[PDB]
Symmetry: D2
Subunit: 116 residues, 4 copies
């Protein structure tokens, strides 16, 4: 119940996720930023038996039927329930690059998701 729902981050991107009983995360991500259009598939895992926040992570490869940014983002963080449910994350966005440019292929950031 907790994780499953629609969330939004500070950028206004939309994350629709279903937490399966087997610890699977599935849904779609609708981004507000970058070189994206439409929704993108997400897949992740979460601690289906947490103790403390619930650790989770998910990945989006920024490719759908419309665009390809040749990049993928991974969000690693934790779900914290209560009145105000939130997912606090740190993310890595890696772009496919030639060997010469790989040193600067990864962006790091942080996103806070609020459940709607």
């Amino acid at each position: 119940a907790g994780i499953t729902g629609t969330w939004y981050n500070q950028l206004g991107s939309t994350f629709i996720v279903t937490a399966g009983a087997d610890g699977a995360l599935t849904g779609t991500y609708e981004s507000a930023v970058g070189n994206a259009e439409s929704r993108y598939v997400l897949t992740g895992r979460y601690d289906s038996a947490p103790a403390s926040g619930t650790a989770l992570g998910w990945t989006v490869a920024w490719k759908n039927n419309y665009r390809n940014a040749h990049s993928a983002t991974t969000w690693s963080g934790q779900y914290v329930g209560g009145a105000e449910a939130r997912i606090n994350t740190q993310w890595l966005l890696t772009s496919g690059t030639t060997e010469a440019n790989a040193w600067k292929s990864t962006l790091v950031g942080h996103d806070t998701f609020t459940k709607v």
Copy 2:
């Protein structure tokens, strides 16, 4: 099956992955370190229509039938094919923590996966 196969990181953990034609990564991760025992389910996404490196990412929630570390790792990187194929990643390991310890809930590192 560039990405599909068995890879090993510097630690000697085993990453068995199947890359779907659609951009899905699925498989098992057998760690050689941390508070784990057994194999863990992984899920990810990758650029199924790359340009030079192939962007990808995956998550492992550190819970199996045997144990629960109440944490999850996300790996973000790129697969580089050729004679000596590699997956160069950066990872984020977030532990489920109280709100008091949330500031130090996430570890960052890098992993190089090879087929040897």
Copy 3:
């Protein structure tokens, strides 16, 4: 003028800094968290001719005359001036470890400093 002053982060830690004309940052950091007591020396660099925020970074080795945590934090971010002056950062906290534990030696986080 901008950078020089007293700042505080979300944890209530105190950062007292002087920006030199040569791009030098010097001051002391008074932490609210970890295994710290008293002030610690900080040293950093900043873009003394910015265009956009002003890029900067500083390091604190968590050792003073009272305690030693055998760890150092680096904050990398940017100063943004105006009504509400702020320093938005991402940080790395590395602990000295044996070779066996080096894989999990680095914490990553984010701090927002408000000028007082």
Copy 4:
């Protein structure tokens, strides 16, 4: 003078460092990549009374007499002495950006410094 010396990262950038008895790191960084030309001033801190690795960090603001990248890199890691001495780091490169591009202002990577 374990740390004091000249080191090179995988890219071939040169790090000339002097470690003060007090925990200060001072020196010059000559990059072999990015938007730079010449040497850059670096400042950092390190654990002057280590336990097994020696925690340290430093910053370089990418501004010299010749150019200004309006960015700064912070390296956080540990020095490991012995026959084949190394400085294993993770770094954060933040560019001064508008508020609109701040979410993607920071790159993350890893550098291994050796004396060869």
